[PDB]
Homo-oligomer: A and B are copies of this chain.
Amino acid sequence: GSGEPREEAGALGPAWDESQLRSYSFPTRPIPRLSQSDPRAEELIENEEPVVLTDTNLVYPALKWDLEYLQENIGNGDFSVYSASTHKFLYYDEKKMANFQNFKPRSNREEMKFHEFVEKLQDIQQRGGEERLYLQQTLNDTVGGKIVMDFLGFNWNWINKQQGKRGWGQLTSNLLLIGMEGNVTPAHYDEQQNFFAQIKGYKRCILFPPDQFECLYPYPVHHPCDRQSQVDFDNPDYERFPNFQNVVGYETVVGPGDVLYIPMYWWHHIESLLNGGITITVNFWYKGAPTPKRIEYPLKAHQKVAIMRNIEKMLGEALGNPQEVGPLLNTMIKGRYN
């Protein structure tokens, strides 16, 4: 699925090896790895299909980053450091905890200074694989001059050529990520174009097209975990999510100089290879190209997902209580569209 490991330059041996990939209950096809000059790449990006561009130098200067360097050249600054009790990082939207008062969060986020992060990070590495941390921070923290330089060294010309050539809109977000081995962010989906610039370490990426909605079972729109598959990929419950047995995604392993496009609405599942050491990556999120007023039929999968999403929110308003959403949809269907 992820293909045979790539060989490191200067006979340094296979980049990674199969034992470092976690086990899953489904097939996968490889995402094509190409050059930014290859016409087929611009194509795939235009038909909103994932690609792995290998020579964009988007993050060239950052390829030298590492803990030591980073702590040494970054200002005090606050760094959101997410922590989990296992490999699965269970992120959640606080603003929606009211709607599901019995939802107990399993991913604390603590603000701390970079060095403090490195500390706890090493601690775990000496006592043991207890928690797993994940520092996610934006690239606007006036950080060490050294860093700002590197941030400037990024290939903006290129990435911008995209933002315009593709017709997308504003760059919604830009985060820096440093994780440990085995870190996994369960499958989920954004409604924005994605570019993941791998830097240090290798990351396994698994994507499912929006049309795989019926097999992934997102949480209810009003649920803290909205946009995330409810299926434990480590132990699917085919009794509740039977169509998970029909899921099929594209996968690939990204290394230091690679940039993976993740078309909006797609489902991505990210995991830092086991025994692969720490991983550093910077991600970019561009708001999508404004939708055409002329809607052609039939609709693309994401257009439906849009529809579904809205109707749910719509009933949230109407009924004045997101809990009643379910019961309504059911009476509306049972015996009628069953």
Interface of A with B (CB < 8 Å)? Answer: 213-214, 217-220, 230, 240-243, 295, 297-299, 304, 307-308, 311-312, 314-315, 318-321, 324-326, 328-338
A337 vs B329: C-alpha distance in the bound complex, in angstroms? 8
CA distance A314 to B320 in the complex (A): 20
Contact yes or no, A326 B331, CB < 8 A? no
* CB of A241, distance to nearest CB on chain B (Å): 5
Contact (Cβ within 8 A) A334 B214: yes
Contact among B214, B311, B338 with A311 in the assembled complex (CB-CB below 8 Å): B311
The answer, among B298, B320, B337, for a CB contact under 8 Å with A220, is B337
- Cβ of A333 and Cβ of B333 under 8 Å apart? yes
Q: Which B residues are CB-close (under 8 A) to A318?
A: 299, 307
Contact across chains for A213 and B337 when beta carbons are under 8 A apart: no
CB nearest to A218 among chain B residues: B336
Contact in complex: B311, A332 (CB < 8 Å)? yes
- B330 near A308 with CB under 8 A, answer no
Q: How many copies does the complex hold?
A: 2
Q: Given contacts A220-B336, A325-B337, is CB(A214)–CB(B315) below 8 Å?
A: no
For A335, what are the chain B residues with a Cβ–Cβ distance below 8 Å? 214, 217, 230, 240-243
- A337–B311 alpha-carbon span in the complex (Å): 14
Residues of B within 8 A of A213 (CB): 331
Alpha-carbon distance A315/B337, docked complex (angstroms): 13
| Chain B positions within 8 Å of A240 at CB level | 335, 338
Quick one: closest B residue to A312, CB to CB?
B332
Contact A299 B319 (CB under 8 A): yes
Residues of B within 8 A of A312 (CB): 332
Q: Which residue of B lies closest to A217 (CB)?
A: B335
Q: How far is the CB of A123 from chain B (nearest CB, A)?
A: 40
Bound-state CA distance A228–B297 (Å) is 31
**When the two chains form their complex, are residues A336 and B217 in contact, meaning their CB atoms are under 8 A apart?**
yes
A311 to B312, CA, bound (A): 10
Given contacts A220-B337, A298-B320, A325-B337, contact A214 B307 (CB under 8 A): no
Inter-chain contacts of A330 with B (CB < 8 A): 333, 337-338
Smallest Cβ distance from A100 to chain B, in angstroms?
Answer: 13
Note all chain B residues with C-beta closer than 8 A to A314. Answer: 311
- List the B side residues contacting A320 at CB < 8 Å: 295, 297-299
Judge whether B315 and A328 touch: CB under 8 Å: no
Q: How far is the CB of A305 from chain B (nearest CB, A)?
A: 10
- Compute how far the CA of A311 lies from the CA of B314 in the bound complex, rounded to whole angstroms: 9
Supply 25 A–B pairs (Cβ within 8 Å), ascending by A: A214-B335, A219-B336, A220-B336, A230-B335, A230-B336, A240-B338, A241-B335, A243-B334, A243-B335, A297-B320, A297-B321, A298-B319, A298-B321, A298-B324, A299-B318, A299-B320, A304-B319, A307-B315, A307-B328, A308-B328, A308-B331, A329-B332, A330-B333, A330-B338, A333-B333
Rounded to whole Å, the gap between the CB of A86 and the closest CB of chain B is: 24
The 5 A-B pairs at the shortest CB distance, nearest first, are namely A326-B337, A217-B335, A297-B320, A214-B331, A308-B332
Q: A50 to nearest B CB, angstroms? A: 23
